[PDB]
Amino acid sequence: ASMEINVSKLRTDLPQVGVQPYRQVHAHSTGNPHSTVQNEADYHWRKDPELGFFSHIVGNGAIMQVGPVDNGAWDVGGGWNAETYAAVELIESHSTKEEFMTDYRLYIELLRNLADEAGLPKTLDTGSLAGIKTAEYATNNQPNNHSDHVDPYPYLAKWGISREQFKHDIENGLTI
């Protein structure tokens, strides 16, 4: 199917962070057990950006672009803010595995697509500066870290997606 992205809540006034080239796409999850994709987009629209901002949200079968790409972001709380080409938030409010999987698939596909768009390798949590990095990986590896965030692995584990499965899906693409 064609990928559809809702840009209705794209917050243009967010600050410039660092400069090109941006070597990373960041994989996050919201840490919010109750919010919908629209709730997240609406809060992101109005919030103090210092609390954290990002570029995309995946949830409820939809993808919303909520911030600029190729801009950096205040998403990971340390030096790799200045490497953020894009930062994708998966919602955490799924009632069932089936509903989770619909969004998980979109999440994998979007992370891969954003890496392609940025000219970055479709790799997960490698040591190279370039690639797709989780918030956990940024927290543990970036210079000047101030975060304690370790998303999205705990939420993926809630729904039976292991570290290895997530890496395989990012790096090889989805299969049946």
Binding site: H28, L51, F53, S147
Partner: peptide, 4 residues
Amino acid sequence: AXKX
């Protein structure tokens, strides 16, 4: 998420 999270300027730090």
